[PDB]
Amino acid sequence: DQAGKSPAGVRYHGGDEIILQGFHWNVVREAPNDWYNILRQQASTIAADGFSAIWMPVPWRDFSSWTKSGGGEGYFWHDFNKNGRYGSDAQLRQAAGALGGAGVKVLYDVVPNHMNRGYPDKEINLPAGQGFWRNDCADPGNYPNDCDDGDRFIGGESDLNTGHPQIYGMFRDELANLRSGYGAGGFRFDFVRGYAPERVNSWMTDSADSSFCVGELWKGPSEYPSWDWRNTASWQQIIKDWSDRAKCPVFDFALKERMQNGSVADWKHGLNGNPDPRWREVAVTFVDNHDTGYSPGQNGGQHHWALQDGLIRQAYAYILTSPGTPVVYWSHMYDWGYGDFIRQLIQVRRTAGVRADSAISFHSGYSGLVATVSGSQQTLVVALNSDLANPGQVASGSFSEAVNASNGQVRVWRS
Ligand SMILES: OC[C@H]1O[C@H](O[C@H]2[C@H](O)[C@@H](O)[C@@H](O[C@H]3[C@H](O)[C@@H](O)[C@@H](O)O[C@@H]3CO)O[C@@H]2CO)[C@H](O)[C@@H](O)[C@@H]1O
Numbered sequence: 001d002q003a004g005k006s007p008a009g010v011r012y013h014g015g016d017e018i019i020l021q022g023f024h025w026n027v028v029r030e031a032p033n034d035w036y037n038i039l040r041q042q043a044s045t046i047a048a049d050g051f052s053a054i055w056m057p058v059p060w061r062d063f064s065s066w067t068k069s070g071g072g073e074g075y076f077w078h079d080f081n082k083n084g085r086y087g088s089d090a091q092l093r094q095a096a097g098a099l100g101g102a103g104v105k106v107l108y109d110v111v112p113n114h115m116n117r118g119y120p121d122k123e124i125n126l127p128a129g130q131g132f133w134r135n136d137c138a139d140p141g142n143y144p145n146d147c148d149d150g151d152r153f154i155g156g157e158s159d160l161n162t163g164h165p166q167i168y169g170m171f172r173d174e175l176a177n178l179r180s181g182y183g184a185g186g187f188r189f190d191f192v193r194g195y196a197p198e199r200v201n202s203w204m205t206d207s208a209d210s211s212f213c214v215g216e217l218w219k220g221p222s223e224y225p226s227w228d229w230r231n232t233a234s235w236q237q238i239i240k241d242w243s244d245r246a247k248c249p250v251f252d253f254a255l256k257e258r259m260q261n262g263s264v265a266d267w268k269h270g271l272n273g274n275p276d277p278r279w280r281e282v283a284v285t286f287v288d289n290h291d292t293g294y295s296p297g298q299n300g301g302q303h304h305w306a307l308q309d310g311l312i313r314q315a316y317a318y319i320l321t322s323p324g325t326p327v328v329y330w331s332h333m334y335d336w337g338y339g340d341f342i343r344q345l346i347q348v349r350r351t352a353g354v355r356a357d358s359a360i361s362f363h364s365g366y367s368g369l370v371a372t373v374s375g376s377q378q379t380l381v382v383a384l385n386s387d388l389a390n391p392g393q394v395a396s397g398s399f400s401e402a403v404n405a406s407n408g409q410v411r412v413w414r415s
């Protein structure tokens with residue numbers, strides 16, 4: 001496991017991570033108060049499946065409830081107490097210790113933008129009129145105001161002023177607490193449109209400078225004002241600009257947008273396919289998460305932007321053979337039966353030595369997506385939904401078949 005920042009100082013922890021999203025949306029309802037126990041028991045299996053890191057649910061307790069129905073998942077926490085719906089503080093420490101002991105770095109989901117301001121019994125009670133809250137200042141719409149230098153969550157009545165020195169320091173100290181007491185090897189920053197990217201750089205510099213980070217910026221060009229250069233920019237440009245300012249990797253919503261809206265051939269326009277290594281190496285690729293994808297249980301989860309089942313194998317083959325840093329969704333791996341396929345592709349990635357900055361070339365004469373990827377140990381030829389017949393049509397050298405699935409719709413060959 002290589003540590004180390006990128007040539008531009010971005011915290012991609014060596015560029016060699018393979019991440020498991022270690023939950024789905026309905027965990028708090030499908031395994032009440034038992035998820036940490038489950039992760040502890042599964043730690044050795046997760047490691048044996050080839051993951052170097054696990055993205056943990058928000059560890060701050062959330063007893064919210066709304067009505068579709070939901071609540072409790074961590075994105076409306078009321079304080080930092082760890083005795084929440086995933087399990088107790090003691091069980092969290094045991095799970096994090098088991099995962100670390102198995103070689104799996106623990107990444108915590110953290111939610112600085114807002115909190116359950118209205119919850120009756122909590123340990124953090126911030127009054128009005130002292131600058132702690134976005135709506136201490138005039139709030140005319142979903143854009144920065146004098147108490148919140150980013151966007152707001154829905155109505156904004158629970159957005160925190162993360163730039164207030166007291167609030168900044170509260171989160172700084174809690175990140176340090178997760179590192180010292182809960183085994184954190186990094187963090188996933190939620191809703192990063194809600195606050196300044198430079199504040200993520202500051203928090204990481206203060207409390208976890210050598211750790212892995214990733215931010216979730218889900219905001220299309222249409223959501224920016226007419227006079228903002230991002231209104232006419234690509235999805236790639238928008239997320240790359242965030243990464244530059246946070247010095248953090250960023251979820252590849254450019255790739256996700258092409259997977260949802262474009263053809264398979266168009267998947268080459270994700271951030272992770274960019275020919276500039278400073279661009280593609282900061283991409284954190286994924287197929288679905290707890291928000292975009294389905295989950296087992298009530299209402300099938302959120303499924304706000306889910307990839308159809310006819311493309312799931314192709315999408316995992318792409319992200320696991322290509323540059324950027326890939327994330328595997330719990331439910332594909334361990335609920336819905338794609339685990340053996342994903343296990344095989346993780347082994348292919350590791351055997352080939354594909355890393356976040358590996359070169360990737362796209363080839364034009366065929367249907368679907370045809371790519372050659374230069375790993376540190378092997379070259380891969382990847383053909384997805386393609387009429388490519390054999391790797392010698394597009395690459396020099398001697399190749400052996402590594403993957404052949406879905407009636408040849410997923411094929412990978414290796415040097
Ligand atoms: O009446 C205003 C009050 O209610 C609303 O907040 C609730 C949302 O309506 C509700 O959807 C849910 O939000 C969750 C998201 O659906 C989910 O995708 C994920 O991001 O976690 C969210 C938080 O759990 O819960 C919130 C808060 O209970 C309204 O947005 C606000 O003006 C205010 O909270």
Ligand SMILES: [Ca+2]
Pocket residue numbers: 001002003012013014015016017
């Ligand atoms: Ca690493």
Ligand SMILES: [Ca+2]
Pocket residue numbers: 113134148149150151152153159160193194195
């Ligand atoms: Ca905000």
